[PDB]
Design a protein around this ligand. Structure first.
Ligand code: HEM
Ligand code: HEM
Ligand SMILES: N=C(Nc1ccc(CCNCc2cccc(NC(=N)c3cncs3)c2)cc1)c1cncs1
Ligand SMILES: N=C(Nc1ccc(CCNCc2cccc(NC(=N)c3cncs3)c2)cc1)c1cncs1
Ligand SMILES: C[C@H](O)[C@H](O)[C@H]1CNc2nc(N)[nH]c(=O)c2N1
Ligand SMILES: C[C@H](O)[C@H](O)[C@H]1CNc2nc(N)[nH]c(=O)c2N1
Ligand SMILES: [Ca+2]
Ligand SMILES: [Ca+2]
Ligand SMILES: [Cl-]
Ligand SMILES: [Cl-]
Ligand SMILES: [Gd]
Ligand SMILES: [Gd]
Ligand SMILES: [Zn+2]
Lengths: 403, 403
């Protein structure tokens, strides 16, 4: 059991849950690979994961080993012998979706993990039904700006059948257009999906903030291109409380972060289409999406407008510009009554989550590199907290792109 | 070999040097412990370490497999067989100290690793001569503000005789006076060594920036107290370029960071006293030392004087105050003409180092959590660089406090 210390307070805890880690991460005693974004890369096997998820579920509701427990087990045995897969009960699916959030080591927002709206789309067929399940997700989750966590679970993977996939990495993304001068107009992260929407017959725009269509894929069919109703996509134009020229930069961002390209794994079952959404932490927008050199890369533009000395690094013009962009994000979302959390509040809440989980299950998988915010690292309490990273199931996992 | 990606550029390398990692770290495939501050804690083993180190030395001078190379291997073999230990040649000690720096995964300053002044103190015989070696180090390294990197190597550990030790964690450190109610006047990080100085006869001040004496330990002797000559301890009064009241906070910091409590390991030999010094990166002073809640903890005081809304996190008052403190540190050192580097220049030079080392050795041991600075993380290039962490020798190691 690894000993983990908080260096600001001096307290000591032991992570006993890590002993239960299901799958293997990339690290070995010879070398640590914790900084890598991708830690890389049947029926008797499926049953072993299915059984242990069922034992988890019944333990969580006290029905440990009771009458319903053994019958659920024998039910799954027969289903897999008959079909090669099995179906989850609706409560097992809700439980599994929440635990997979709960287990996500890179999520700072997990204090909220017990509050998630699960929409069961497992009866889905055709891309037009996908699109309708999706549009209902967006409307429920946006809630006119009072954002609410939700996940929509499309049908699981099963043998011989194609897959339900959402090709977009998020439900709301801005286009990125390659151009003759080499660079990109819009979001460079989305250059690949933007030329795929264009390939599949989408006439493009020419703005830096053109909302992309959806490329939805039903099993064993090409993807179909749907346009989101513009009144369903809530956006926040960015202004600054005191810098009147900030608004003239024409920056904006969207209200709803809805990740649509990860795979949900519950009890050996795999759901390659299960978009989930919550709300944003301010640094995600104002530091990473707007100030990453390979994203909108606006930081020098703001610094020029602030009349900072951009010819020496030691003036900290980069630091001052980033702070005001983050201020603009917080101010604009609050003025628009869209849910947003600043990085100080979020990390403080994650510390409370760590304490809750220490008592609930003896530890908490956490990825320090991703929990610590991308600005003001050591000004937040998570910087001073040692963390243990490991993989538990149910889980959210990366998956190959469909194409 | 592990594949390593830079996400700003897209470039990919493979760290083939990690396959040579001798000593094991704390991670397993089950769980990564990369965020822990302390990752750890006879003839034929000594020989294999000595042989490896000699091989390194002769590769470094492009004379591998030469007559000199084979003869030095045999010579080390004969001395170990006769005495159980051996002595480094002078040239080997210089090379080994530079390689220990080169190998230190938590150091962002390693672009400089070849420029290191190595003072050989292995004939030192008393605490009094120890103090003279230390004063000569400080005088050379300080160089009236034009800082020069240096290390002084005291005698190696050997059987049947105590170690040389410097009890202080750095050669220059401010007193921390622990108060009855748990508060501290001075630097809270130095409360232990402050109480040991007093217990060993030092008459304490009552300031916040009182320079501590040195407790110097010769073999098999209690530590002895030595006062540093005030004229050898260069200090920088802190002022801000545009906030004139900042000067009235009465803050100061010292010019020379000189770590004195780590163990230097070279070719299986151990040097428990081997102080080394370079110059500061400004975030060490302005962010960690002055703004850590468990250090000087000045953030709220500064934010109040700047008239910031400290009642709500979403004002980003902490971020704004931390930036101006960091500006004051850089401005103040530049005004005093004392060497300092800001976190942007330092991290840019570290990216150059990684490219150099990829060519030279096929990889570079790097601790992401320590290389990324404590403010403005994703605004520096190292945030977006995947890193592999591992232990090479020669090495600087932690060791228990001698009391
Ligand atoms: C309720 C508000 C939420 C906030 C403020 C929040 C915050 C965050 C942040 C800042 C990250 C780091 C993402 C990045 O830097 O790219 C993250 C990661 C993650 N979150 Fe949360 N999150 C929330 C809700 C949710 C929900 C509802 C789920 C799923 C049910 C979830 C699952 C995940 C996963 C799987 C990751 C890791 C993604 C990856 O590894 O790429 N989060 N979260
Ligand atoms: C020349 C300018 C240098 C700069 C700007 C620099 C910078 C740094 C910084 C910022 C750290 C992190 C320290 C902390 O957070 O406590 C570090 C760690 C370290 N530095 Fe450097 N350094 C320099 C020179 C040197 C030299 C000359 C040596 C040894 C000969 C050295 C050896 C180390 C080691 C071993 C560590 C790891 C300390 C630990 O693990 O606690 N550095 N350095
Ligand atoms: N895509 C590539 N790299 C890449 C890899 C990983 C990433 C990180 C993507 N995380 C997006 C994300 C995930 C989780 C939470 C949020 N934020 C939230 N607050 C919420 C979202 N939902 C409910 S809350 C955002 C980005 C890019 C490529 C590599 N090669 C060609 S493309
Ligand atoms: N305090 C404890 N732990 C503790 C453990 C580790 C640490 C980290 C200590 N880094 C000090 C340091 C190291 C390397 C470089 C610099 N900076 C420079 N620029 C240079 C210095 N030389 C040439 S360049 C500063 C600090 C505290 C305790 C344990 N038990 C009771 S207290
Ligand atoms: C190389 C490194 O793992 C990569 O840049 C990580 C670091 N930490 C992160 N932290 C968050 N929150 N989001 C990220 O995308 C990343 N990227
Ligand atoms: C818990 C965590 O490892 C600890 O706070 C580390 C994080 N990164 C660091 N990085 C540097 N450069 N110096 C430090 O002291 C630390 N502290
Ligand atoms: Ca100007
Ligand atoms: Ca000899
Ligand atoms: Cl995003
Ligand atoms: Cl220091
Ligand atoms: Gd102007
Ligand atoms: Gd002024
Ligand atoms: Zn690891």
């Amino acid at each position: 059991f690894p000993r983990v210390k908080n260096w600001e307070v001096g307290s000591i805890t032991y992570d006993t849950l890590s002993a239960q880690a299901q799958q293997d991460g990339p690290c070995t005693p010879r070398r640590c690979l914790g900084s890598l974004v991708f830690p890389r890369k049947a029926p008797e096997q499926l049953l072993s994961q299915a059984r242990d998820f069922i034992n988890q579920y019944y333990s969580s509701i006290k029905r440990s080993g009771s009458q319903a427990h053994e019958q659920r087990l024998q039910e799954v045995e027969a289903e897999v012998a008959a079909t090669g897969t099995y179906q989850l009960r609706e409560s097992e699916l809700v439980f599994g979706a929440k635990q997979a959030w709960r287990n996500a080591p890179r999520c700072v927002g997990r204090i909220q993990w017990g509050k998630l709206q699960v929409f069961d789309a497992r009866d889905c067929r055709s891309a037009q039904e996908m699109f309708t399940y999706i549009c209902n997700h967006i409307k429920y989750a946006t809630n006119r700006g009072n954002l609410r966590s939700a996940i929509t679970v499309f049908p699981q993977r099963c043998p011989g059948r194609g897959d339900f996939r959402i090709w977009n990495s998020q439900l709301v993304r801005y286009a990125g257009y390659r151009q003759q001068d080499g660079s990109v107009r819009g979001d460079p992260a989305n250059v690949e999906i933007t030329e795929l929407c264009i390939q599949h017959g989408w006439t493009p725009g020419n703005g830096r903030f053109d909302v992309l269509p959806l490329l939805l894929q039903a099993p064993d069919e090409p993807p179909e291109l749907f346009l989101l109703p513009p009144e369903l996509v809530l956006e926040v134009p960015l202004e600054h409380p005191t810098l009147e020229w900030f608004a003239a930069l024409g920056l904006r961002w969207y209200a709803l972060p809805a990740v649509s390209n990860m795979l949900l794994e519950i009890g050996g079952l795999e759901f390659p289409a299960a978009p989930f959404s919550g709300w944003y932490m301010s640094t995600e927008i104002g530091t990473r999406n707007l100030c990453d050199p390979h994203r909108y890369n606006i930081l020098e533009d703001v610094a020029v407008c602030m009349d900072l000395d951009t010819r020496t690094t030691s003036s900290l013009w980069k630091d001052k510009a980033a702070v005001e962009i983050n201020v603009a994000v917080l101010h604009s979302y609050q003025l628009a009554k869209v849910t947003i959390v600043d990085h100080h509040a979020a990390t403080a809440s994650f510390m409370k989550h760590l304490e809750n989980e220490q008592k609930a299950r003896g530890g908490c998988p956490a990825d320090w590199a991703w929990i610590v915010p991308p600005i003001s690292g050591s000004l937040t309490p998570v910087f001073h907290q040692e963390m243990v990273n490991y993989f538990l199931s149910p889980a959210f996992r990366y998956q190959p792109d469909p194409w």
